[PDB]
Scaffold this active site. Sequence first.
Site, short mmCIF file in Angstrom:
data_model
loop_
_atom_site.label_atom_id
_atom_site.label_comp_id
_atom_site.label_asym_id
_atom_site.label_seq_id
_atom_site.Cartn_x
_atom_site.Cartn_y
_atom_site.Cartn_z
N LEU A 21 0.84 -1.22 0.00
CA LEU A 21 0.00 0.00 0.00
C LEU A 21 0.87 1.25 0.00
CD1 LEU A 21 -2.76 -1.30 2.39
CD2 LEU A 21 -2.94 -0.70 -0.03
N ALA A 25 10.14 5.55 5.97
CA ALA A 25 11.23 5.31 6.94
C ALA A 25 10.64 4.55 8.13
CB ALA A 25 11.86 6.64 7.33
N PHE A 26 9.32 4.59 8.33
CA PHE A 26 8.61 3.87 9.43
C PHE A 26 8.57 2.36 9.16
CE2 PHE A 26 5.34 4.92 6.37
CZ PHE A 26 4.76 3.69 6.17
N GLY A 27 8.59 1.96 7.89
CA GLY A 27 8.41 0.57 7.43
C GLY A 27 7.49 0.50 6.24
N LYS A 28 6.57 -0.47 6.21
CA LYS A 28 5.72 -0.78 5.02
C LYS A 28 4.26 -0.94 5.47
N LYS A 45 0.46 -2.23 8.89
CA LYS A 45 1.69 -1.40 8.96
C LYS A 45 2.70 -2.21 9.75
CE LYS A 45 2.60 3.31 10.76
NZ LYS A 45 1.94 4.17 11.74
N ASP A 142 2.43 15.99 11.88
CA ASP A 142 2.99 15.56 10.58
C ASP A 142 1.87 15.44 9.54
OD1 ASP A 142 5.12 14.93 8.89
OD2 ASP A 142 5.14 12.84 9.52
#
Length: 338
Positions: A21, A25-28, A45, A142
């Site tokens: 999706l 930088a947090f992941g996928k 996530k 953010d």
Amino acid sequence: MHLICQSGDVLSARYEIVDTLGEGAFGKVVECIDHKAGGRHVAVKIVKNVDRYCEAARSEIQVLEHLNTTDPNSTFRCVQMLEWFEHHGHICIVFELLGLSTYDFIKENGFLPFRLDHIRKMAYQICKSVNFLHSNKLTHTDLKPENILFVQSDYTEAYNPKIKRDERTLINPDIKVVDFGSATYDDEHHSTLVSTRHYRAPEVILALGWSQPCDVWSIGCILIEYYLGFTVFPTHDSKEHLAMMERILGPLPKHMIQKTRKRKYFHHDRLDWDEHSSAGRYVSRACKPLKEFMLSQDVEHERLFDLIQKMLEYDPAKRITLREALKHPFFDLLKKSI
Ligand SMILES: CCN1/C(=C/C(C)=O)Sc2ccc(OC)cc21
């Protein structure tokens, strides 16, 4: 993380990965079939296994438990979290499957803007959703088009061979807000650096302290980007960013310039900026007063730009609240009741 997020992988003995999706930088985030909710598609996530993003994911979970139980129907359009779990040392947060980001939609259409009718409905919903956080002693910190998502796949798309891309046409523009990994409570410690460069408020750049109002600035930056198809702050440099603010919005209030510890940016009481350098003429070309970005003189364009100007007030003490934004004449069209 490559190693644990492939198509066909099963997470927590139920979530079959079908697609990606989004990443960062947090992941996928991956689309999964949930074989234990009758084959429902969900989003998962998978959070990078680093202290920063592990801590952020624990914070996000606590925020979502609070927002989700405070507003069980999602009247204020925050993403619903279904549950979380651990997969090979990674925190995985399961959410309701939403649609495309506002970012991907604009970008894949060749940076073509949303229609004004759509922006009006989207700005209202974004303002309502974030005002809900404000009411519950939170600042998102953010807000950006990547974190505003269409609820649904409520568009059509057709391959156009003349430009060699699909074009997507919005049917319905309803959104939700995602990414509470940065959201900060009034009473909690405030990071010095918050927000994504293009969306960062002047009180953040100048480290003067921040609150709810830094969200209002970010929403202002989102709305102009929705209207133009690109940002008016296209930079990778805080001083340049402040120079762009001076050319688009007019000069910074002396009090903010004089109070800031970020004095490397200044010289006496002006920005330390060579107007006449290569880079300075470049910024001058890329920049003009806000109201000159207007694509029509038509009154509903004036109404948007007046709200954008109030959201992009430099002084966070003076900047419009979302409570007041929700009452702005730009939204009168939505309350038409003959
Ligand atoms: C990748 C965007 N995204 C999120 C991003 C973050 C940083 O949290 S959370 C989320 C939930 C559903 C979804 O559906 C499509 C997408 C989604």
